[PDB]
Amino acid sequence: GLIQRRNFSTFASEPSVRFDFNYMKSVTPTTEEYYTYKSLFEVVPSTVPTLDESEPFKYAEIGHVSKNGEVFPVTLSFEDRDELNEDLFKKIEKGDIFLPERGNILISAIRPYLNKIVLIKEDDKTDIYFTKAFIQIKPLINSRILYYALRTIFSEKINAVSRQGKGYPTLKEDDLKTIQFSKKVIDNLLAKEEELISNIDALEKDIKELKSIQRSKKEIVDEVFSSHFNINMVELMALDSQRRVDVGLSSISSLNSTIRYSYRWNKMKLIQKYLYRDIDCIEPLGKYILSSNNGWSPESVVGGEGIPILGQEHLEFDGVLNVSPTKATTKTKNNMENFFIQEGDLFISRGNTVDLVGLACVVETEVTEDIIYPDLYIRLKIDEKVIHKKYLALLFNSFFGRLYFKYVSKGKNQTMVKISSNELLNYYLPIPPMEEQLEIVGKIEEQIGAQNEIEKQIEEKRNQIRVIIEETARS
Amino acid sequence: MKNWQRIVEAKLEQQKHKVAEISLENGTVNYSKKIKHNRNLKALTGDEEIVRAFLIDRLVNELDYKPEYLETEKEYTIKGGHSKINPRVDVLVKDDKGNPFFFIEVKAPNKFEEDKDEIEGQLFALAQAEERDFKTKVKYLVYYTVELIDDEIVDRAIIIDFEKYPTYTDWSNGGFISTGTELTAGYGEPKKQPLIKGHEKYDLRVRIDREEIEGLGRNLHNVLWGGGGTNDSEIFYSLVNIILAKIQDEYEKEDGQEYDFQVYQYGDNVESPQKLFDRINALYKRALREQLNVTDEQKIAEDNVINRNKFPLNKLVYTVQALESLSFLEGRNSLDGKDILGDFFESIIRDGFKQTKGQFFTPTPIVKFILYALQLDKLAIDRLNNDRELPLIIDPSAGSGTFLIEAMKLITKEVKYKQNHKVKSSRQITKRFEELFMPDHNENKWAREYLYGCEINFDLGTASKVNMILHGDGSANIFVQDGLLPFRFYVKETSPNYLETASPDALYGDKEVNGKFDVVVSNPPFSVDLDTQTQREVRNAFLFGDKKNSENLFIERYYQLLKEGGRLGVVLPESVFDTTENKYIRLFIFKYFKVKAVVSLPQVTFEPFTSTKTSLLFAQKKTKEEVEQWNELWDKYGKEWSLLKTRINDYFSYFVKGRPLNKKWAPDVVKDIQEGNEDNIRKNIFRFLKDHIKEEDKNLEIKDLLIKYAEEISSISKHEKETDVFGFYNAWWVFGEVAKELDYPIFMAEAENVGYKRTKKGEKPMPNDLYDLEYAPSTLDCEKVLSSFDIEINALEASKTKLSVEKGLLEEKLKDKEDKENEKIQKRLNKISELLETIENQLDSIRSKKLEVEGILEKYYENNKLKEEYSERDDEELINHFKHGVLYQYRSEDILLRNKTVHKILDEIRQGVIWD
Amino acid sequence: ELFMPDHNENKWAREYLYGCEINFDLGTASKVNMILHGDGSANIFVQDGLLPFRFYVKETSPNYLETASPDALYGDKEVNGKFDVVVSNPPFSVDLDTQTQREVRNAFLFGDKKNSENLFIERYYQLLKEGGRLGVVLPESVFDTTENKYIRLFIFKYFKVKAVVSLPQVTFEPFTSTKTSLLFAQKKTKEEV
Amino acid sequence: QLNVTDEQKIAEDNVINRNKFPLNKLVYTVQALESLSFLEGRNSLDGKDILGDFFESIIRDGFKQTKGQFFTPTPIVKFILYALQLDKLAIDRLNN
DNA sequence: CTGAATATTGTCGGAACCAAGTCTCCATATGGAATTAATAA
DNA sequence: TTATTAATTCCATATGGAGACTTGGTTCCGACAATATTCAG
Ligand SMILES: Nc1ncnc2c1ncn2[C@@H]1O[C@H](CSCC[C@H](N)C(=O)O)[C@@H](O)[C@H]1O
């Protein structure tokens, strides 16, 4: 760890005479002609607004605000106050609400390192109320300049005054009033304005345009799979909401082989019967399976010194292994080679939530190093003449595999529902001809590749939007 | 080559009966009728005959009882292990008469280690089988062995009769009873047990050697815990109370007088559970009067050792009767080296305590880091080398004695073995050294006068006392009462009571101060709530007793306990360091302590129990000659602050608010308003804002300065609220001035990984930032370790010679058989040859690793030591060899106290901050 | 005699309401609750729930939880067929006591498997009358998984399953959050087995 | 109320262990429950098992894991009895 | 008739923290292997 | 006339766990100022 050395006098920096390590990691003699909170901003005391009842107002907690300074408020109305959102209305009635005045900045008080600072823009409409967990400041200088100087720069001095105290690392208005902002950093940004606002505005509107067409990695798989097979997605989500199945005693042993009569199995049967009403290409998977080798999960330390190991978070709805190992072991089992990922392998997740169990992916990434797949991965070397593994993985990630594994995953603990080899061998999935399987794969490969390219341009723009600020400040 | 083996072999080749001189056979000498054998071989059969021959000699030499011919019975059947076993119930003594009447099982001092189910394996369990097959009347059963005990070589045996318990299950319920200790001539012995008369005969069986600790630990856990409905902890506490009762029984009893920790099998009938409970409870209810220092007759009489309905009586009988046959006071011998019952208790603690969250322990790495960061070994050496005295380590929060046992082992291993070079023999120093350390069987006797602790929990206090006694020490110094009481309450009924004196202090609230201890290591509770009556009873002995932050009261108690110049090490949470509310406690610490070190521990130290962040705090209590200076400064900069407050208030009233001039303000306030004198007012307004002003404000008008700095003038114009200690002055201004005048460097460090990561499913090694282990031991006996390698060499060479023996046996069978059996002989010979290449591929690697180990010792260890250029153990090549291979067997689980360079937090703490 | 004295109306409780608990503290708390709600803390046995029926000694005239005789179509094992409304929440995968392990190899059909949550189903069968009702809370692993086939087969032989409803994981949110389900079955008469 | 007929157990048993349980803590506990009406007050607090909820809140989950110390919530229990038609069964048994 | 001190009226400040989301090593059968084995020409 | 079991070892493997670690931020009690109070000199 760090080894510093400070003096007694340095305990006089704050009237709270704190002497914690985190606060004084930043404390040091200063030569820059620092500014203070008086010149830059002004803390605005919070007040409880008089909300009307007819108009549905919009509320936002800390969790609704994103890391990149976006708000996703919840539309609440006193007219429809049910028990699901009763807690929010309880907070509102208690008095944890305030309407930000236009142009202010709202810094979150809890956990500053997430950089959850939001700016109320001077333009636009439909103002949104916020939880008093934020802190209002009125920037005497240009609001956008202070906003960008607080998000990108000064992100470590704000994090150097947070108070943990047997729990949440939180801030206080006094902590902000204690900050020691520099002069050159702020005056360089303020003087070089009228272009450092135009460039950032253009880049932000480009980012907004890119986000305007973004789609999730699951809807794309759902869209094309719904395009084929002529599946009414609206009716499927309606039959899934039914909570009443009345089967008979005779229809318990049909294709059971182990006498399972739980409600989940009996609703699986109904859903699978509904899904295949018009599709006639279905054959059991157990025919086209050659092996079901599991993985190896030794005791692993995060960021250790040894062979890397994958995790359940590296399987995405796309169908490609993320190959982003985090955990590392140093233990051997005399059979290391059999538990190393190879190009073309088909891995299915074994053990997750009821909605994320059974996700499959093909490696499709040439990596020369050896990476262990945990025992929560089932590798499925199969017959490469009818299945076309990519198609199988993307079928499993689709609603055709997200509903079967949602109701066949055995387990007492619903948080780690697991699938066994028997479910894989007894799964009746639709197999179209090899030519027909290739067409879908091309579609939900090109569309998702375009989506990923969208996901890459936005990151590059958001990185240069702060590189510009850094180079402007330090100049 | 075991200790007993050499003497017993010497008497095998020096038999007074002349029965074992002929090796590998005895068929041509008298008293060798054992129905040959039934499975394989009639020759040397290990340790069994080695001691059974001497037993036969003793039977004939001194026991006599006429010579006859030692005509014994035949072998029965046992289904033990692979294939049925046909044993001759070890050795036999004439079976008295034709039918089996006497059974003896010869064992060995080292054989008590491997197996403990053979105490009755050929005894009771098969005794009924003999009585049911041959219809005999077996009555007398011997668990015979003679270890090394002087010329008399007295048998430390467990001899039992077969008239008390019809079956062996009831005998086990009778807790491994023994109706005989020493073999008696003339066919005598009492029918019932000879009891536990503590003079001679049975004694107390004080030679606990090895692995019977593990046998008992597995036995107690598999029976007492069991299942059903309980919650582990109370079972553990009941066992602790039983051990406490046994310790009290050993304390109170004298020569003879038997022992109350028995079963008292009157004749043949076993004890009724009620009377045994009454006896054990009387032992326990008198233990409290003598050990727990309780005086309330009502409390000491309205209780019991076990809760009955949550602890069945059969379990009580089994425990109370199995726990004997080993002294809990002096029984620790570990064959040779002592300290064997401690490891037993930490085996018990680990398996069954269920730490949960309410009762967790400071992890041992943290405790050792705290002890070394205080330079406890150096302080102890200096105190012994100059004052002929040891420190007075205390623990006001105590617990399981975690902070005390570690300190005990630390001092013993650092002043006696590792750093005794620092101790110089100067007669009186040597006198103290032999008075406190030299007796190995009572090496932990110094800490009968130095270690102290206070545990509020009754069960935790009892467990701490039991841990304290088992290692061997005067646990009477731990008080099971509260730790936040006046010193008069801590009454020890023997020895000097350092935690009893009290006296009001001049410059501390005119309150009691013990001021006798030197080191105060503790881990205060994270959030204690106390209660109304308790809070009212304690808000007179502490300055900040009114404030309901009782956790902070411990620091005040730490000041009250430490003498002038003592050392303090704590595990205080971050709230002391960061939270605004706990501002008074920081000022108190700065006033009465010289803060010398602080380590920001990571958020994973107590991860399975609680995620609250903590930071170790180290300090040295200031002497009075510095507290007086602090008090003088606090007034010199307090009067100035008050005057400045008055002047600034007047200036704000006039210049800003425009109030009419009043001549009654002050002679210096209304002296320059008419004359202007802006600079004089400017100096005052700057000085009042000692750290708020900026250079750019040096040009603003007087009115603007008091307006710009408004909403802050009032903030720096308030006293210290409800506090009569700091006075009616803003501490922040006064403290800022005092710290400027009284400034000293302070160590500052943080740790991101302590070395462990405990979870609900065990723990796992992690990188360590606090300290570094030693791995390679400092001193390793080259002859001893090389003898261990040579022992493994010849152990494998024995298998090599055996395989060569079958090779020679079968190399002549090829010509003996032509085709049919020849094919099988050839196949067996081929696989024997394959085993030969396997064993030679073992042997060549064995030789290569012998050579590399010898190279390691020569290039690193010189001669039974470690070279000065490698003593720091910073070389990666030296370390890793001990981390792998067979050297990992020895290793060294000791913290490396490097003082040449810095590589871990502990290194620069011992090389940085100086304790004066 | 049962429902008329307003002051003390819970008189039938002593003679028409039984219960077993293995923890003495829990037993005392349960008895305190019974006397809080109008007495009835006479049949709360503080002994184990899977012990032989002859062990449940009580100091009163009616001791219905004592009768036990071998049953023809059960493997000749003790059956106390008098109770009707058997309801409980078995401990899931709890370790049986070593002393009780002696008496589980006998008097139980599948008594060779140390599985607590499945042994109590058999004990219920030993307790319901020939026509009694059984509403129990069981883990979803009983109704699923391949290692529990015998119990599911065992239930379908002697019992006549009437309903099963899967509770949400929000049931035991602070404590364990395990997927459980309520099973409602009625014992079949000997003329049906 | 518990019908303990033996006069010896009553002479040796106790409400609390004054050594395990400090007496000032007993004072506080009595003070907290002085005004409370456990009897005749249970009607208002319908569907609230005080003693069981106290066990759940006090005993750690670590001890409630080895043994199945997980109490069924009251809403479920009222559903189990009403789903079994226990009311109708009791009425029929009383009638016939 | 000028209080300040206790009914309380709504607001800060922390917390032996703690829900939400979702990712995990390991004890334990187990059976198909091995083994011994008895079929029987 | 052997070599088929079917038991008794023994392996790496499949299965499942009243789970359990990670990350982020939430309620609620306790002060507490400021309501009010509050009786009195
Ligand atoms: N005056 C007091 N007030 C509260 N707890 C006290 C106390 N005096 C001693 N203790 C004990 O201090 C313990 C805090 S945890 C003990 C420190 C650490 N776990 C160790 O074993 O060394 C509690 O279990 C409590 O029983």
For B483, residues 6+ apart whose C-beta sits below 8 A from its C-beta are B396, B397, B398, B454, B455, B456, B554, B557
Query: What CA–CA distance (Å, rounded) separates B573 from A134?
Result: 27
Q: Are A59 and A76 in contact (CB under 8 A)?
A: yes
Total Cβ atoms within 10 A of residue B883: 12
Question: Ligand 1 centre from D59 Cα, in Å?
Answer: 19
> How far B686 CA lies from chain A's nearest CA (Å)?
17
Alpha-helical runs (H) found in B857-916: 876-883, 905-911
Q: Which of A154, A161, A167, A75 has its CA nearest to residue A117?
A: A154
Query: What CA–CA distance (Å, rounded) separates A282 from B406?
Result: 69
Q: Which of C127, C192, C132 has its CA nearest to residue C162?
A: C132
Q: Report the side by side order of strands in the sheet with A301-302.
A: A301-302, A327-329, A307-309
Minimal Cβ distance to C135: which of D42, D65, D83: D83
Query: What CA–CA distance (Å, rounded) separates A440 from A446?
Result: 10
Minimal Cβ distance to B458: which of D20, D25, D31: D20
Enumerate the residues of chain B whose CB falls inside 8 A of the CB of residue C96: 227
Total Cβ atoms within 10 A of residue B61: 12
Alpha-helical runs (H) found in B488-576: 532-538, 553-561
Query: What CA–CA distance (Å, rounded) separates A302 from B847?
Result: 39
Continuous segment of H or E residues that includes residue C135: strand C128-139
> Cβ separation of B533 and D27 shorter than 8 Å?
yes
Q: Which two tokens stand for residue B621?
A: 């209590």
Q: Ligand 1: which atom is nearest the Cα of residue B550?
A: 3
Question: Ligand 1 centre from C6 Cα, in Å?
Answer: 52
Q: DSSP string of A226-282?
A: HHGGG--HHHHHHHTT-------SGGGSTT-SS----HHHHHHHHHHHHHTSS---E
Mutation to probe ligand 1, out of B233, B356, B370, B397 (largest number of atoms < 8 A from CB): B397
Please indicate whether residue B566, judged by its CB atom, sits closer than 6 Å to ligand 1.
no
Query: What CA–CA distance (Å, rounded) separates A281 from A274?
Result: 15
Query: What CA–CA distance (Å, rounded) separates B395 from B409?
Result: 16
Enumerate the residues of chain D whose CB falls inside 8 A of the CB of residue B358: 60
| Secondary structure of residue A107 in the 3-state scheme | strand
Q: What is the 3-state secondary structure (H, E, C) of D65-96?
A: HHCCCCCCCHHHHHHHHHHCCHHHHHHHHHHC
Query: What CA–CA distance (Å, rounded) separates C121 from C119?
Result: 5
Radius of gyration of chain C (CA): 17
> Cβ separation of D62 and B458 shorter than 8 Å?
no
Q: Which two tokens stand for residue A256?
A: 């059971």
The region that residue B157 occupies, defined by phi over 0 for left and psi between -120 and 50 for alpha, beta otherwise, is beta
Q: What is the 3-state secondary structure (H, E, C) of C34-99?
A: HHHCCCCCCCEECCCCCCCHHHCCCCCCCCCCCCCEECHHHCCCEECCCEEEEEECCCCCCCCCCC
Q: Are A352 and A329 in contact (CB under 8 A)?
A: no
Q: Which of B92, B165, B89 has its CA nearest to residue B130?
A: B89
Q: Which of A428, A411, A429 has its CA nearest to residue A420?
A: A411
Minimum CA–C1' distance nucleotide for A420 = F15
Tell which residues of chain C come right before a gap with C–N over 2.5 A.
Answer: none
For B873, residues 6+ apart whose C-beta sits below 8 A from its C-beta are B772, B774, B775, B776, B866, B879, B896, B898
Q: Ligand 1: which atom is nearest the Cα of residue B399?
A: 21
Taken in order A418, A424, A426, A430, is the CA torsion positive or negative? positive
Enumerate the residues of chain D whose CB falls inside 8 A of the CB of residue C137: 72, 76, 80
Backbone angles phi, psi at A450, to 5 degrees: -60, -40
Query: What CA–CA distance (Å, rounded) separates A450 from A456?
Result: 10
Q: Which two tokens stand for residue A226?
A: 């719904």
Total Cβ atoms within 10 A of residue B150: 6
Q: Ligand 1: which atom is nearest the Cα of residue B398?
A: 22
Enumerate the residues of chain B whose CB falls inside 8 A of the CB of residue A19: 577, 586, 595, 598
Number of residues written out for chain A:
475
Q: Which of B772, B227, B601, D71 has its CA nearest to residue C172?
A: D71
Q: Nearest 5°: CA angle at B425, between B422 and B431?
A: 120
Query: What CA–CA distance (Å, rounded) separates A41 from A62?
Result: 22
**For residue B827, with 0-12 CB atoms within 10 Å meaning exposed, 13-18 middle and 19 or more buried, which class applies?**
exposed
Q: Are A76 and A85 in contact (CB under 8 A)?
A: yes
For B849, residues 6+ apart whose C-beta sits below 8 A from its C-beta are B885, B886
Q: Which residue matches tokens 């080559």?
A: B1
Dihedral angle at the C-alpha atoms of A411, A417, A418, A424, nearest 10 degrees?
Answer: 100
Mutation to probe ligand 1, out of B366, B456, B534 (largest number of atoms < 8 A from CB): B456
For B812, residues 6+ apart whose C-beta sits below 8 A from its C-beta are none
> Cβ separation of B228 and C97 shorter than 8 Å?
yes
> Cβ separation of C22 and B228 shorter than 8 Å?
yes
For A94, residues 6+ apart whose C-beta sits below 8 A from its C-beta are none
Q: Are B443 and B473 in contact (CB under 8 A)?
A: no
